[PDB]
Amino acid sequence: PKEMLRAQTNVILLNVLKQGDNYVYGIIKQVKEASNGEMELNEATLYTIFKRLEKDGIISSYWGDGRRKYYRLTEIGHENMRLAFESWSRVDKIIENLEA
């Protein structure tokens, strides 16, 4: 379901940036490693997602002295990531009680 793989890739990328500013190929490398090789993200996919995140002010970009484009989680981005993690944490516990 396209809308769901989009949400998953979004959460992964934001967690990569949570650990530190990074550039596209460094991100793709980290995600391939952490996924045991089963997630090879495409460059153009990152650009598509990063354009929406930059527009929404969740991330921003800057140049790093050949010159790579780096991305950073903004202050809003960090705060939104925290709200998401906490709200979905509640969802996780709700599902736990339903099953018991």
Residues that bind its own copies (CB under 8 A): 1, 4-5, 7-8, 11-12, 15-16, 19, 30-31, 33-35, 38-39, 80, 84, 87-88, 90-91, 94-99
Q: CA–CA separation, 13 vs 41, rounded Å?
A: 10
> Residue 7: what residue type?
A
Q: How far is the CB of 13 from ligand PHN (least distance, A)?
A: 12
Tokens representing 69 are: 């484009």
Select the binding partner of residue 76 from Cu ion, ligand PHN, its own copies, none (C-beta < 5 to 8 A, by kind).
none
CB of 62 or CB of 88, closer to ligand PHN? 88
Most distant CA pair in the chain, distance: 56
CB of 9 or CB of 45, closer to ligand PHN? 9
With DSSP H G I counted as helix, E B as strand and the rest as coil, what are the percentages for the chain, rounded to 5?
65, 15, 20
Among 6, 9, 11, 70, binds ligand PHN (CB under 6 A): 11
Q: CA–CA separation, 51 vs 45, rounded Å?
A: 10
Query: From the annotation, which residues make up the binding site for Cu(2+)?
Result: 11, 92
